[PDB]
Design a binder for these strands. Structure first.
Ligand SMILES: [Mg+2]
Ligand SMILES: [Mg+2]
Length: 994
RNA sequence: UGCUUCACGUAGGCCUUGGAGCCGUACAUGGUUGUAACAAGCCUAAGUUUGAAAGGUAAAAACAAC
RNA sequence: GCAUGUACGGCUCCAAGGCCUACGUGAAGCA
């Protein structure tokens, strides 16, 4: 029957078009691919895995790979996938148009369609909406027949593999009937596309459940195993499986996983007063490791090993704030400092016109950088001797070039694909442009890591990076304010106004001490500071000396510190002698170690045993550097291996430091102030020069961002009202803790702290009380911020918020841990706890109906990437409202079993629409003159078997319910209409012929 | 007697992240005088979640000589 | 007998995800 196949194909193509359009709504870079910037791994193909990708996976991987956010993340693909993905990305628009056309052609009521020609006629008065020409349709049809042939060949080979593998009498007859029909049908006929090809095309862009239903309804047969369950399974190797993740190449769940892995470990802070914490942690770790290396079962070992606390030696919070700012297309007007690459050095040398004297060596065959630089290094390119080998213009040019070369960071316009932010001592570097008297001046700012954190906090909480000004009202962006600060700093530096607040900042946090605190005449060095410096040096030297004689030093342990100590001792003795001998700066400079001599001396001392008889060592340490190395000539001659010369150096150093602590009076403080380099309190005569230096290259404090107008700030400020030492970070911690999160500070202060006793002070408090607490507080805040960023990336991956309640800890009341770290830390088990999602009626497009109920559904977090993307929540709200589902144990309306009931109702509705469409088609195809004399519903009602059971209104309600798939229970008036329709179908015997 | 769909275990592979150790490459920085600590780190307040002010120490960014 | 930073490649451990398989179960529908 042609009508049966036509209706089934119309339904299948409509479903395929709806599913395909549910993924793409806008352009999404279609037909504009430019390759992927990702390190592709050619992963081997799994055994016993059927080849072939559905159209949905083609679309998803074409979108994910050729996106732009995939910059260097080391994705995994199979063999021969990139070129076919490029072909699909080229012809996806044609594929979409072909699917839409085919759906429109098959879904016809008036003048029932015939077979689809090889040309796909689609014209004349029948279809005067020609959207595909001969060549475009030819390309799409060629792609389809290629895929059809590939699937047929793969299925035939898999079928042929069965007969060799043993088998019996029953197996032989089952494999014989299926090969002849699988190899039987073909894509091509006499200008007629076969029905099997159309079903294959329709099922290629569906899901496995709908494809299975359509294949089962394709042929009645006997409802048993359809041709050994092999012809029916021919069309389902495509039609994406569901319950299979589509976010493998998302590049936003990648950062979420990175953040989770970072947060799943305990920090190792370097505070002196936190040592008992880590001592207890080490003892516990060692004891439980020893206990775990005695087990006999996997489960017992897993239970024992849950008490071990992993640790990390450092954390990078400044990188994650900068990455968050770069992802949201912020900055955009600054110039960030990036790490220098060898390509950057090569390009700088090329543009600077310095390797132009390479006689055009044309080393372009190497292509990759860091090898051409190797060739110049082998050639004899040095660049470190070219500040004295040319006329006076050399100083203006080569010194600046050398200064640029020594810097290891470069300034570039920020980009999404750029990630190598320069982080030096937790700081970042920005470069802005200001206008003064109609001139563009570049200003460099060192931005603290707490400015960025407050910026990210303001962006995350309010949603906008705008801060309301205290005066003159109005809202200003945080991308701004920085530029105003730079301009005002420049203006104040020119005006020399360093005794008033800049932006209500109490200008000692800005304007460093060279400008805000000066004296007129040079100060007099006090007696106390020299003694303090001498005592500190003595204490450090004797501490290292005492610590050295415990590892027994058999030419091992630290050697750099020893060489530094010898060199410092020699230099200090030489300086003390030279000041008394009254030598000028140039006299001492020529009599000391320059760069080359210092490098040679360091190498010789590092390899002391290697050079003791070579003439180079004698020439350096006994001929040239005679006066400088005088205090050590006697020891170096009768010694070797450097382990004795270090002891002699430490002995001489300690003897000298003891011998000086009684030769420092008020009448000779100048000499040792010069020797130990203690200075005064700057000069007023050099205020202008320092202002000129500082007006361009200054720093940005973290108090520039004010959280006064954030929601809840006034209540928090009034609540405490007595913690005189409180700061703005307590507000951040309070806000982030009220939203749900975990930090290792909670575990440290509630599970480990009560078990240990701290060393007490003279007063009776904890020794090192202040800094320790600050340290702990610091950790908490940073960790909380990181978690927030992670949650943000979750919203960028699954499209839904992360709503979950984290349980709070309880203080320890025992003498043992009794609480495993891997069971207390929630980031270890974060994929095994239900999350909340809010479901609301969507109606048409992105328009949530106000004053409508909102439902809360609990869903496992491993179902957010497979069977939650593009789910058509209208079915969920229809099932919740129209039906009356029951709430199970801990009643919360789980997404599971809701999916199951919804799928069952969808199958029932599919049967209903098939039946109604067949009956409507038969009714219309006959009484065309009667219909042409809504009135169509009245025509159907008159041409039926109703007496008093239902009116035209009931038929209309049934038709709108069935056509649009509004999920409702069976009720009563629906059953009689279905019985009448079945009676009509059986009376004419419409679907019983072969 | 069985059929598919989910979910949980058990055992394998094949990839990708996170911490720690042993490593190796490859590159950059390292010297003597003065100017230079606004930014970041360390030490000082409370036996429980208080980074404000103050006192030391501290050379990350910068300027000029060999 | 060397310190810091950067990028890469290993080995070694732990852990987390994703894809394939092969055995058990638990549940929903169908013959
Ligand atoms: Mg999943
Ligand atoms: Mg302070």
């Amino acid at each position: 029957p042609q009508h049966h196949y036509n209706t089934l194909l119309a339904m299948a193509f409509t479903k395929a078009h709806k599913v395909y359009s549910d993924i793409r709504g806008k352009v999404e870079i279609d037909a504009a691919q430019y390759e992927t910037k990702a390190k592709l791994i050619e992963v081997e193909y799994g055994k016993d895995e059927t080849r072939g990708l559905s159209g949905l996976e083609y679309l998803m991987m074409s979108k994910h790979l050729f996106s732009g956010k995939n910059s260097n993340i080391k994705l995994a693909v199979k063999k021969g996938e990139t070129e076919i993905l490029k072909e699909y990305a080229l012809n996806e628009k044609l594929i979409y148009t072909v699917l839409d056309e085919l759906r429109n052609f098959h879904s016809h009521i008036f003048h029932e369609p015939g077979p689809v020609s090889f040309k796909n006629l689609y014209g004349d008065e029948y279809k005067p909406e020609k959207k595909l020409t001969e060549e475009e349709w030819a390309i799409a049809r060629d792609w389809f027949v290629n895929r059809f042939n590939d699937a047929k060949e793969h299925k035939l080979k898999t079928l042929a593999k069965v007969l060799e593998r043993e088998g019996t009498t029953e197996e032989k007859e089952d494999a014989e009937k299926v090969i002849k029909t699988i190899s039987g049908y073909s894509f091509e006929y006499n200008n007629c596309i076969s029905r099997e090809a159309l079903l294959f095309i329709a099922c290629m862009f569906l899901r496995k459940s709908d494809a299975a239903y359509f294949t089962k309804k394709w042929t009645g047969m006997k409802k048993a195993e359809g041709v050994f369950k092999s012809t029916q399974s021919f069309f389902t190797d495509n039609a994406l499986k569901e319950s299979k993740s589509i976010l493998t190449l998302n590049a936003d769940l990648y950062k979420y996983r990175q953040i989770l892995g970072v947060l799943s470990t305990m920090p190792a802070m370097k505070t002196d007063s936190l040592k008992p914490f880590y001592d207890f942690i080490k003892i516990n770790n060692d004891s439980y490791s020893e206990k775990a290396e005695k087990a006999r079962s996997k489960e017992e070992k897993e239970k024992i090993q849950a008490f071990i606390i992993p640790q990390r030696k450092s954390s990078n919070y400044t990188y994650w704030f900068m990455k968050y700012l770069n992802d949201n297309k912020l900055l955009d007007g600054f110039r960030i400092a990036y790490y220098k690459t060898p390509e950057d050095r090569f390009m700088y040398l090329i543009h600077n016109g310095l390797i132009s004297q390479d006689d055009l060596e044309n080393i372009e065959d190497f292509k990759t950088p860091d090898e051409k630089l190797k060739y110049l290094r082998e050639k004899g390119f040095n660049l470190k001797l070219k500040m004295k080998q040319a006329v006076g213009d050399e100083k203006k040019s080569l010194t600046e070039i050398y200064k640029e070369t020594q810097r290891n960071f470069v300034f570039k316009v920020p980009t999404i694909e750029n990630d190598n932010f320069c982080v030096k001592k937790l700081n970042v570097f920005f470069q802005t442009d200001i206008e003064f008297n109609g001139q563009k001046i570049s200003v460099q700012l060192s931005v603290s890591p707490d400015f960025l954190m407050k910026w990210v906090f303001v962006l995350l909480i309010t949603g906008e990076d705008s801060i309301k000004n205290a005066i003159t009202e109005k809202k200003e962006k945080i991308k701004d304010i920085l530029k105003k600060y730079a301009e005002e700093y420049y203006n104040r530096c020119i005006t020399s106004n360093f005794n008033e607040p800049l932006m209500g900042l109490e200008a000692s946090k800005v304007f460093p001490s060279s400008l805000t605190s000066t004296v007129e005449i040079d100060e007099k060095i006090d007696k106390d500071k020299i003694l303090m410096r001498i005592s500190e040096k003595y204490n450090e030297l004797t501490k290292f000396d005492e610590e050295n004689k415990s590892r027994k030093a058999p030419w091992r342990f630290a050697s750099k510190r020893k060489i530094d100590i010898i060199l410092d001792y020699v230099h200090l003795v030489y300086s003390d002698r030279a000041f008394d001998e009254k030598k000028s700066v140039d006299a001492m400079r020529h009599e000391a170690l320059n760069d080359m001599e210092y490098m040679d001396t360091f190498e010789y001392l590092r390899y002391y045993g290697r050079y003791r008889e070579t003439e180079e060592f004698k020439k350096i340490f006994f001929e040239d550097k005679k006066l400088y190395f005088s205090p050590i000539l006697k020891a170096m001659k009768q010694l070797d291996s450097l382990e004795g010369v270090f002891n002699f150096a430490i002995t001489g150093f300690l003897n000298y430091l003891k011998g000086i602590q009684s030769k420092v009076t008020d009448e000779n403080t100048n000499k040792y102030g010069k020797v130990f380099k203690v200075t005064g309190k700057s000069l007023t005569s050099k205020i202008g020069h320092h202002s000129e230096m500082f007006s361009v290259n200054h720093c940005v404090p973290q108090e520039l961002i004010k959280l006064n107008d954030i929601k809840g700030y006034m209540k928090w400020k009034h609540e405490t009202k007595d913690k005189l030492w409180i700061s703005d970070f307590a507000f951040i911690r309070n806000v982030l803790e009220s939203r749900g999160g975990f930090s290792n500070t909670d575990y440290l202060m509630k599970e480990v702290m009560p078990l240990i006793t701290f060393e007490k002070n003279e007063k009776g408090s904890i020794k090192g009380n202040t800094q320790m607490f600050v340290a702990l507080s610091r950790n908490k805040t940073n960790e909380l911020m990181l978690w927030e960023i992670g949650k943000y990336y979750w919203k960028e991956a699954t499209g839904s918020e992360f709503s979950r309640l984290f349980k709070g800890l309880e203080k320890n009341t025992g003498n043992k841990i009794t609480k495993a770290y891997r069971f207390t830390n929630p980031y270890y088990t974060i994929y095994q706890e239900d999350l909340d999602i809010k479901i609301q009626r969507k109606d048409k497009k992105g328009k949530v109906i106000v004053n409508s109920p909102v439902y809360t559904i609990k869903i496992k977090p491993k179902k957010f990437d497979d069977e939650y993307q593009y789910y058509e929540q209208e079915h969920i709200v229809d099932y919740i409202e129209n039906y009356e589902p029951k709430k199970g144990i801990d009643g919360h309306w789980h997404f599971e079993e809701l999916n199951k009931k919804i799928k069952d109702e969808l199958a029932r509705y599919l049967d209903d629409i098939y039946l109604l469409m067949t009956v409507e088609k038969h009714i219309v195809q006959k009484d065309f003159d009667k219909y042409a004399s809504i009135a169509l519903n009245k025509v159907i009602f008159d041409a039926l078997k109703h007496k008093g059971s239902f009116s035209a209104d009931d038929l209309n309600i049934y038709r709108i319910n069935v056509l649009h798939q509004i999920l409702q229970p069976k009720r009563e008036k629906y059953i009689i209409i279905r019985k009448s329709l079945i009676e009509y179908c059986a009376e004419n015997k419409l679907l019983k012929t072969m």
